[PDB]
């Protein structure tokens with residue numbers, strides 16, 4: 001009844017997320033490869049995962065999942081399982097878009113963790129743009145962190161897909177979107193990763209985090 005049908009809340013919905021690479025010859029004939037992609041441009045509730053199970057994948061720390069979930073609100077917390085498409089230097093980019101009925105200034109933080117420990121963090125702020133009665137937040141074509149571009153190139157070298165999955169078992173990303181002015185948390189997404197078989201493109205499965 002009040003359980004989410006997609007990644008978002010009544011205050012802020014994810015519209016699209018993609019991590020991609022455009023090869024150098026895309027100026028001649030445009031193409032882009034999506035490593036991972038969520039599009040939310042009716043349905044039953046999303047499935048749920050108990051947040052305690054994924055606590056180990058994420059560090060106990062200030063700004064960590066356990067502390068954040070305790071501060072709430074619980075309904076803003078999601079877990080995304082990605083099967084990444086690693087079958088493809090070029091431009092490596094990330095694009096995010098959100099919507100709301102409120103006019104807000106968002107702070108979006110992406111925390112990359114390896115073996116639970118935070119390795120890199122990217123923090124951006126985006127002001128709303130009023131369009132057709134609703135407010136849109138566009139963080140498009142952001143350059144991917146060089147740590148992740150380097151990690152992707154090493155990962156694609158591995159000779160077996162199961163070795164890629166072994167490495168990715170210890171690799172997570174935590175995305176926190178907060179109201180810049182109030183500091184209240186609007187959306188928190190935990191990401192876990194596997195490699196898709198070489199024949200299948202990227203897919204995802206979204207869960208509500210409950211406790």
Ligand SMILES: COc1ncc(NS(C)(=O)=O)cc1/C=C/C1CCC(F)(F)CC1
Pocket residue numbers: 019035036084086094110112121122143144145148152155173191193
């Ligand atoms: C949720 O993902 C992301 N969120 C945010 C960013 N932002 S950032 C730190 O500024 O780069 C990057 C990613 C990259 C995802 C990659 C990870 C490695 C992969 F699994 F092999 C393919 C997908």
